[PDB]
Amino acid sequence: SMACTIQKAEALDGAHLMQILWYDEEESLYPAVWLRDNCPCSDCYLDSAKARKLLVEALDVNIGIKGLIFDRKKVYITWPDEHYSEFQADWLKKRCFSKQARAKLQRELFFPECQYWGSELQLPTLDFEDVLRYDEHAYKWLSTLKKVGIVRLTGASDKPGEVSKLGKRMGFLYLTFYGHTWQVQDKIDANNVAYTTGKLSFHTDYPALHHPPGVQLLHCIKQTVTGGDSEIVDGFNVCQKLKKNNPQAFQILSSTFVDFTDIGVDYCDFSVQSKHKIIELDDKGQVVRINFNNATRDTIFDVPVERVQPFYAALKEFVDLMNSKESKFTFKMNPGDVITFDNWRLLHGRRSYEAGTEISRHLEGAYADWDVVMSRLRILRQRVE
Amino acid sequence: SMACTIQKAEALDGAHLMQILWYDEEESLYPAVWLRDNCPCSDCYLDSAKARKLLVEALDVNIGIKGLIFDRKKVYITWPDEHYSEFQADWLKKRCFSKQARAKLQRELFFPECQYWGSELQLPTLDFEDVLRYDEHAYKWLSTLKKVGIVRLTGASDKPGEVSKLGKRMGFLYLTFYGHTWQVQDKIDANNVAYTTGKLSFHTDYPALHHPPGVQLLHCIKQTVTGGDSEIVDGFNVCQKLKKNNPQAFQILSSTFVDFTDIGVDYCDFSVQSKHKIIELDDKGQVVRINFNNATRDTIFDVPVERVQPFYAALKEFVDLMNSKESKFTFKMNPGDVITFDNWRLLHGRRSYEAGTEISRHLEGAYADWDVVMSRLRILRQRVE
Ligand SMILES: C[N+]1(C)CCC(C(=O)O)CC1
Ligand SMILES: C[N+]1(C)CCC(C(=O)O)CC1
Ligand SMILES: O=C(O)CNC(=O)C(=O)O
Ligand SMILES: O=C(O)CNC(=O)C(=O)O
Ligand code: NI
Numbered sequence: 001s002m003a004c005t006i007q008k009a010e011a012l013d014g015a016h017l018m019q020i021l022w023y024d025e026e027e028s029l030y031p032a033v034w035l036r037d038n039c040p041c042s043d044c045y046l047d048s049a050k051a052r053k054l055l056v057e058a059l060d061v062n063i064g065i066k067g068l069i070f071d072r073k074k075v076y077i078t079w080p081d082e083h084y085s086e087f088q089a090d091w092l093k094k095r096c097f098s099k100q101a102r103a104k105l106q107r108e109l110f111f112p113e114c115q116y117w118g119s120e121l122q123l124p125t126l127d128f129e130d131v132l133r134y135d136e137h138a139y140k141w142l143s144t145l146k147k148v149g150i151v152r153l154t155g156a157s158d159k160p161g162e163v164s165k166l167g168k169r170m171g172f173l174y175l176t177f178y179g180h181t182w183q184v185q186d187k188i189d190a191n192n193v194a195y196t197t198g199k200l201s202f203h204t205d206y207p208a209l210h211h212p213p214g215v216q217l218l219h220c221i222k223q224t225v226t227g228g229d230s231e232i233v234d235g236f237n238v239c240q241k242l243k244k245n246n247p248q249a250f251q252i253l254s255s256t257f258v259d260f261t262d263i264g265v266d267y268c269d270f271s272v273q274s275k276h277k278i279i280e281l282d283d284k285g286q287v288v289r290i291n292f293n294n295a296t297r298d299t300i301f302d303v304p305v306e307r308v309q310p311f312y313a314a315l316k317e318f319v320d321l322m323n324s325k326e327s328k329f330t331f332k333m334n335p336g337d338v339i340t341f342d343n344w345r346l347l348h349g350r351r352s353y354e355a356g357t358e359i360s361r362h363l364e365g366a367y368a369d370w371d372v373v374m375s376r377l378r379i380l381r382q383r384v385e
Numbered sequence: 386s387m388a389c390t391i392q393k394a395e396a397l398d399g400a401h402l403m404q405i406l407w408y409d410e411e412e413s414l415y416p417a418v419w420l421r422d423n424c425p426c427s428d429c430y431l432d433s434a435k436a437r438k439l440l441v442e443a444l445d446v447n448i449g450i451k452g453l454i455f456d457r458k459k460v461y462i463t464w465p466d467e468h469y470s471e472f473q474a475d476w477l478k479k480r481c482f483s484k485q486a487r488a489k490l491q492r493e494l495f496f497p498e499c500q501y502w503g504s505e506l507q508l509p510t511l512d513f514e515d516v517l518r519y520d521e522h523a524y525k526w527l528s529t530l531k532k533v534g535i536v537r538l539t540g541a542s543d544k545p546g547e548v549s550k551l552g553k554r555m556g557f558l559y560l561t562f563y564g565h566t567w568q569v570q571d572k573i574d575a576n577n578v579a580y581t582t583g584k585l586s587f588h589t590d591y592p593a594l595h596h597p598p599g600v601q602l603l604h605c606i607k608q609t610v611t612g613g614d615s616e617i618v619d620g621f622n623v624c625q626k627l628k629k630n631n632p633q634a635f636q637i638l639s640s641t642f643v644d645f646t647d648i649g650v651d652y653c654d655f656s657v658q659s660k661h662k663i664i665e666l667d668d669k670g671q672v673v674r675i676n677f678n679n680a681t682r683d684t685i686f687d688v689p690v691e692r693v694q695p696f697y698a699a700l701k702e703f704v705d706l707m708n709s710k711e712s713k714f715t716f717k718m719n720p721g722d723v724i725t726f727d728n729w730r731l732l733h734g735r736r737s738y739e740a741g742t743e744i745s746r747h748l749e750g751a752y753a754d755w756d757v758v759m760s761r762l763r764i765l766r767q768r769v770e
């Protein structure tokens with residue numbers, strides 16, 4: 001393309017910069033030190049690993065270009081210490097430091113597109129076996145999971161082992177103290193409120209961990225008619241509404257460290273403690289994770305006394321917003337249904353149901369790391385494209 | 386004790402607070418809403434899970450105490466809606482909201498004690514089998530690992546499978562794309578610079594992940610005489626020196642998001658991307674993690690052009706400080722040695738060695754999550770005490 005063809009290349013600014021004039025008449029600037037740092041020759045770069053061999057120690061941060069020649073597709077550079085580098089035009093173009101270029105590349109790397117939703121949610125639904133079998137369907141699955149925060153898979157069996165197949169489709173599951181997979185059912189001497197018939201209000205799973213699970217998989221094996229409906233809410237949407245309606249509540253929940261705890265025995269014996277802000281913001285002030293499970297929020301609360309009641313007042317507002325008819329989406333899982341969702345963004349709940357002699361309700365669940373999911377998503381996109 | 390015995394209990398401030406006068410004449414304040422939130426009765430609290438059943442929805446954030454009686458060891462409270470609660474004196478005392486009380490409890494939960502070191506490091510060393518066999522030794526191991534950031538274990542075998550035993554002693558290992566465990570040796574078509582004979586400058590492992598491994602285990606199976614010495618540095622100590630010597634460099638490295646990448650095939654196929662600040666600060670400005678591997682730092686660099694060379698200048702200063710004779714500690718692993726260290730705090734390196742026809746050097750490594758390690762540490766402390 002004209003955009004990726006070199007019309008002129010030259011060293012500028014004490015030879016500390018290279019400028020490319022492209023044939024579309026746009027110009028790009030590349031710091032000399034970055035070029036040297038990213039020399040792709042076999043001394044500096046290990047092709048089989050696609051990784052840098054060059055040490056920081058070898059880099060003169062005040063380096064300038066000693067010599068430069070070019071043709072339409074390549075730049076050829078000599079450095080002051082006689083090192084020699086070649087850079088490809090398309091490789092340079094992609095890495096252009098302009099905001100527009102960098103932003104475009106970031107979107108391609110990290111799939112930032114996000115669709116907020118409330119009670120109007122149309123639950124994205126795909127077939128289980130299709131997803132396992134076809135890359136086009138697995139791509140739709142993971143891309144939708146990232147964008148919308150949840151996908152329902154229908155047509156799985158009513159037997160354990162289904163979430164493990166999805167785990168393999170992704171890469172591998174995220175092991176925790178509750179196992180590689182775990183059975184959500186009523187249990188004698190339950191080590192977790194999830195393993196009872198009680199109502200679960202909106203929560204994220206495992207805030208007791210510093211790194212809570214990114215993605216949750218829940219497969220319905222048995223369902224009861226006496227209750228047990230699922231409820232979800234878009235935590236990012238709720239946070240936006242909270243900041244608007246009650247900035248003071250938002251400020252408290254996005255700045256106060258809450259202690260979470262989990263003690264007991266399952267995969268092995270554990271005694272787990274963490275601290276999270278319930279609304280976790282990035283350095284730009286955007287919400288990147290919600291960390292909230294009212295069951296595992298500790299009795300220990302590490303704040304001064306005067307901050308305690310305002311925190312609870314803020315928390316109540318947040319929960320009231322989640323429960324709003326405009327915010328929450330309700331549905332009931334059937335045997336063979338699997339839901340897969342963003343556990344950093346969505347909060348989920350379940351309605352109480354009745355206990356009985358034998359098991360009337362059974363889900364099998366598992367977790368996955370977002371980096372594992374994003375890796376598979378990147379690869380799938382490449383295969384389908 | 387006099388400290389944990391109740392002399393007087395009363396409701397204050399519109400009954401929105403409870404005050405305890407202890408027999409040591411100290412006073413403690415407990416917000417009414419926190420008391421109600423943390424009622425330990427069987428309606429509100431699930432004993433078998435040690436978890437809260439009470440919903441945020443059930444909590445009146447403006448609640449006050451309706452009635453209160455007490456004896457030396459318990460408080461008995463009635464609430465406005467006729468709910469009834471009992472709280473134990475020692476339980477209350479521990480959770481006192483005074484800064485001194487909260488801080489003491491936080492130290493007990495999270496083991497914050499930290500000993501910074503440089504080239505004067507005395508490498509903490511324990512016997513491998515002792516650690517597996519005796520809780521007192523496993524406690525010394527993990528507590529020292531947390532405090533100092535590294536422990537050497539001697540007297541393991543010269544065969545694979547040793548780091549897996551330590552993994553079980555902790556609880557379980559942290560699975561990544563390179564496997565449950567992995568073999569550090571020279572490999573044809575290496576997918577990582579670690580799997581070559583090249584020099585590795587100081588780095589943390591796996592900054593290409595959003596959640597890099599907290600603890601690293603490295604077991605020497607075979608060692609070469611031609612090089613391959615290990616080097617470590619206390620990243621937290623180095624960061625302190627950098628902030629002092631070059632606050633501008635510290636500011637850049639603690640504020641600039643660097644892209645990391647890892648693409649290839651090992652446990653399965655992967656295409657991994659992340660962003661980290663090299664010096665990662667908490668909300669108080671204290672360093673909590675270093676994220677830096679020069680091999681996996683991407684060619685993609687998502688900053689404006691004018692920030693590029695100053696970043697490299699800052700990075701060079703940081704690396705130069707790490708390499709200072711006062712900072713780094715050098716040693717050579719022997720067959721049967723295992724080092725276990727804090728991969729969020731320490732940076733580690735290895736000297737190049739010579740390639741040859743058969744394998745002259747072989748380490749087996751694995752990772753563990755700090756939450757898994759801290760859990761085991763908490764349990765061990767309880768067993769030994
Ligand atoms: C599967 N299981 C029990 C893991 C821990 C979650 C939590 O307690 O936050 C609930 C669900
Ligand atoms: C074991 N292995 C290969 C995992 C990835 C680390 C990294 O590339 O940061 C190097 C060490
Ligand atoms: O039982 C359900 O429907 C939901 N269960 C959970 O969210 C859980 O295990 O924490
Ligand atoms: O080979 C060594 O001694 C150290 N290896 C590593 O730090 C690695 O695998 O990244
Ligand atoms: Ni849950």
Ligand code: NI
Nearest residue numbers: 588589590733
């Ligand atoms: Ni390493």
Ligand SMILES: [Zn+2]
Nearest residue numbers: 039041043044
């Ligand atoms: Zn080169």
Ligand SMILES: [Zn+2]
Nearest residue numbers: 424426428429
């Ligand atoms: Zn109660």
